[PDB]
Design a protein around this ligand. Structure first.
Ligand SMILES: CC(=O)SCCNC(=O)CCNC(=O)[C@H](O)C(C)(C)COP(=O)(O)OP(=O)(O)OC[C@H]1O[C@@H](n2cnc3c(N)ncnc32)[C@H](O)[C@@H]1OP(=O)(O)O
Ligand SMILES: CC(=O)SCCNC(=O)CCNC(=O)[C@H](O)C(C)(C)COP(=O)(O)OP(=O)(O)OC[C@H]1O[C@@H](n2cnc3c(N)ncnc32)[C@H](O)[C@@H]1OP(=O)(O)O
Ligand SMILES: CC(=O)SCCNC(=O)CCNC(=O)[C@H](O)C(C)(C)COP(=O)(O)OP(=O)(O)OC[C@H]1O[C@@H](n2cnc3c(N)ncnc32)[C@H](O)[C@@H]1OP(=O)(O)O
Ligand SMILES: CC(=O)SCCNC(=O)CCNC(=O)[C@H](O)C(C)(C)COP(=O)(O)OP(=O)(O)OC[C@H]1O[C@@H](n2cnc3c(N)ncnc32)[C@H](O)[C@@H]1OP(=O)(O)O
Ligand SMILES: [C]
Ligand SMILES: [C]
Ligand SMILES: [C]
Ligand SMILES: [C]
Ligand SMILES: [Mg+2]
Ligand SMILES: [Mg+2]
Ligand SMILES: [Mg+2]
Ligand SMILES: [Mg+2]
Lengths: 128, 102, 24, 102, 24, 128, 102, 24, 102, 24, 128, 128
């Protein structure tokens, strides 16, 4: 099906395959989720193309481990993923993402600014 | 034919009187016609005249238009894509189709 | 050299009316 | 294919030797050919050669031609529309199709 | 960017002749 | 069906719906018609797009309440409506339309002049 | 797809690798492909690959190509027409189709 | 404004070969 | 729709979002759509959406694109041809189709 | 005068997936 | 069928209709033919578009009454008609056509010269 | 089928027809082959378009009688033929072709150089 953002609470075999491509650093084994520690992913034609981890603390939220697979970049996947995480967590008024682990801060900062975030010391912030 | 809500024409960049291709997911038929405007906000997709032999009410379709341009501009072209669910509720607009992965 | 490219599309709209007597 | 009374070609702006699409309201067939001229005033619509597999005498059809132009001119283009009833009696000519309303 | 537009149409003309042996 | 001009003598439920969109000022209830007080309308794909009221006094005729729905303007609907009213009342040699109630006299006067009428004090006239 | 004797390509003005339409008088099928060259003088019309689902040996077809040009030049354009009988014996070449009369 | 015109045609040629295994 | 390994697009000169024709040797169906990219190296040929009514897994197809150009350049044009066997293993690329001989 | 020419082709590729629910 | 040149020896009802359009001056009744007085015609989609009368005198031949219907001129009908009359009478080495009755000598002389004839006093000649 | 290079060990009737067109100088009768005297041909839609004779002497190989039928030249047939002969005889490190019998040395030398051979006295050489 068309590009769709999903909250993953249970992982299929294929989700595990795909998450290992998105995040080779992580064992899908230790991707534990609960109500305040979430995984959102972008699905297209039965495969995950991107994912991000979300930590909720009421009005404050944090993003980590955002990654779109290399092969499908610059086609709006990351933008849609983050738009839907924000839209689906309307109680969060201030979002933060650290700059830890990013492949290229120049690329990441252009993407985060296009998504309405402001570059700050150590990362990017979006408050309403 | 096919009369289409003007808002949907706008979202896909399709013009009134433009040639369009219609691909029917329900029955597999594929045909070519031109766009008639329907009242903005009506949600109408009306398959009219001889084209009514190719679709039924409730069928799910893709409506596309095609343009020509030089090779160099084609390499960086971005199509105007609009996605619908339910009773013609527009879910998303975009400017690219993702890459299908293994 | 001129290419033919997808200009845009409406994905999975639903037919509301199908009438042989309509224009057409 | 199709030989067409020259007066009808003129009213729709269709040229002799131009590519045309034919959409058959009677049987649903859709095909593409080119225009042959028929004697002015004869009222002839003659489906000839291989195209005769796609229509019968008495079938009701729409005959269309398509042209290309830049986007800016396409936004203000006016098609040459001609409407027929009975035995190919021309009822009206116009330069636009109305908007279909709910 | 070049569009394909309806140039004109003959609406609901009636076929007068249908002959496999005609040119064609 | 294709754009068609009709004389309305009986009103369907859908004609009443459509006339309320064309003329929100009027109750379809008090749109009485007879041989000298007529309603003509433009029909397209099972809906009325425009209408006008016609008052006949033999060789003299009057037009009032001409309106094409906003969404379908500048596509020849009004022109065809008035051409067919005139053609279907060949005994009328002088037509009049007042300027009362018109949204924009500049638009109306360009339309009436395109239809062969001459701008006069208080309205437009067409005599043969 | 369709491999065609080079002499026939020349007579109709059709190029190797050009898009062509094929209209089958025997079975009514209509399809589009491109021209492959066949040896000059061979008289070959060879319907190849997936296109072989659309024709049989002995079927009688019309093979056409289409070109684009501005309106003004289209009004005085002359098509390259070539007529065949028997075993692909070329009878006549011409630059116009007659008017069909009542 | 650009028109699509018949460039030329081969009228009533006869198929000599029809083979799914040929290129194509 | 049709998602195609990017390497195969490159070998045939076909662009993402370009119009393509698909000719099915297995079942004879012929249809037109546009190219979606698939991951480089995946060997994918994925017939998607309404187009899935026109093909099955394992069917053998030809996928073509067409371009326009002036007559003079058309006479010396060289198409980008790529040939596959087995499980989408590319055997050869070339710039011409041979002449079919008697 | 503008011609339509074969730009390129993939000859005898094999379909790997056929799915009505895929985009499309 | 496609444009075809025929020698008419017998006339159908439709041939008579068509010859009256081609030659309103003549009664089809008095279009008698024999081996040396022939009628050739151009046929297209079951109708005659043009005709000519041919008088044979062995190595000498004469053409008269050449006419293509007005509606189908300048599409090669007349040229094909005369090419086929000449080709089908290879024993004729000198052809003549008078200028009697021609609508426009300027048009006729351009046509006859395109067909290889030389303009002479009183008409056109073709010798091999 | 598509253009394909084959090693011919047995000759069909049609192969004999085709080889007589490719090589009118030779009787197919005296085209004897064995493991070190080979014939390679280019096949397209059930006909041979080109051929070459190959003589193997271990690490040394010789090409003779290369010819593509005139009608199908300048479409990559000869190039594919020689590429496949070389690829299918990887034990050969030095190839030679004499200039004997060539229709036009200027054409042959442009072709052989495009195939990676160097022009030498009396012919062309390719060593790895
Ligand atoms: C364990 C862990 O993951 S640690 C975290 C590691 N993560 C990383 O290192 C990030 C690696 N990079 C990526 O994943 C991607 O490049 C992302 C997430 C930055 C962007 O995702 P994409 O899907 O390619 O971005 P998308 O196409 O939605 O871009 C949206 C907008 O961002 C901007 N943008 C994105 N990429 C770029 C770029 N390369 N250069 C400039 N601007 C860019 C543009 O404004 C773009 O809009 P436009 O295309 O209309 O100009
Ligand atoms: C209770 C009651 O109704 S009281 C009466 C209230 N009525 C109103 O206020 C009138 C509101 N306006 C309308 O209904 C319409 O704008 C009308 C009736 C004036 C015109 O109807 P339309 O269908 O849009 O006109 P149509 O397309 O037939 O136009 C014909 C010609 O008129 C002229 N014309 C029409 N609209 C315009 C315009 N906005 N500007 C300039 N010229 C115009 C042109 O010459 C046009 O021909 P063209 O398109 O080839 O240039
Ligand atoms: C009882 C009786 O009939 S008496 C005899 C009465 N007959 C007449 O008065 C003749 C009336 N005119 C005609 O019938 C036609 O105009 C004819 C016979 C002269 C010509 O027939 P057509 O079919 O129109 O000619 P066709 O299309 O074959 O023309 C061949 C060539 O002739 C020349 N030609 C024909 N018409 C013209 C013309 N109007 N001007 C210039 N050249 C012309 C051209 O060289 C043309 O070739 P091109 O089109 O490639 O330039
Ligand atoms: C008994 C006996 O046979 S004795 C031997 C007799 N043989 C002969 O006399 C050879 C006759 N000639 C031929 O058979 C052909 O012309 C051959 C074999 C030389 C070439 O075969 P072709 O299939 O036409 O060559 P192919 O199309 O593969 O050409 C490959 C490259 O060679 C070069 N080339 C080939 N022909 C030419 C030419 N006429 N001029 C310039 N370069 C040429 C080009 O670089 C070409 O690549 P390009 O088309 O991308 O520019
Ligand atoms: C929309
Ligand atoms: C007409
Ligand atoms: C030919
Ligand atoms: C490839
Ligand atoms: Mg992306
Ligand atoms: Mg209007
Ligand atoms: Mg003529
Ligand atoms: Mg070659």
């Amino acid at each position: 099906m068309k590009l769709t953002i999903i909250r993953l609470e249970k992982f299929s075999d294929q989700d595990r395959i795909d998450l290992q491509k998105i995040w080779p650093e992580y064992s899908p084994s230790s991707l534990q989720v609960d109500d305040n520690h979430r995984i959102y992913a972008a699905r297209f034609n039965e495969r995950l193309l991107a994912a991000v981890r979300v930590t909720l603390s009421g009005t404050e939220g944090a993003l980590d481990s955002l990654r779109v697979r290399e092969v499908t970049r610059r086609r709006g996947v990351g933008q849609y993923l983050l738009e839907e995480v924000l839209r689906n967590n309307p109680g969060v008024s201030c979002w933060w993402m650290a700059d830890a682990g990013v492949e290229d801060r120049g690329v990441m900062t252009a993407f985060m600014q296009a998504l309405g975030f402001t570059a700050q010391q150590g990362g990017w912030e979006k408050c309403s | 034919x096919c009369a289409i809500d003007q808002d949907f024409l706008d979202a896909a960049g399709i013009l009134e009187n433009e040639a369009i291709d219609i691909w029917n997911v329900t029955n597999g038929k594929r045909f070519s016609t031109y766009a008639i405007a329907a009242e903005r906000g009506s949600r109408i997709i009306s398959v009219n005249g001889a084209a009514a032999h190719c679709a039924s009410v409730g069928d799910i379709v893709i409506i596309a238009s095609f343009v020509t341009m030089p090779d160099e501009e084609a390499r960086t072209w971005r199509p105007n894509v609009a996605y619908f669910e339910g009773d013609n509720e527009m879910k998303r607009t975009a400017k690219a189709i993702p890459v299908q992965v293994a | 050299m001129i290419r033919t490219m997808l200009q845009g599309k409406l994905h999975r709209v639903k037919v509301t009316h199908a009438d042989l007597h309509y224009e057409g």
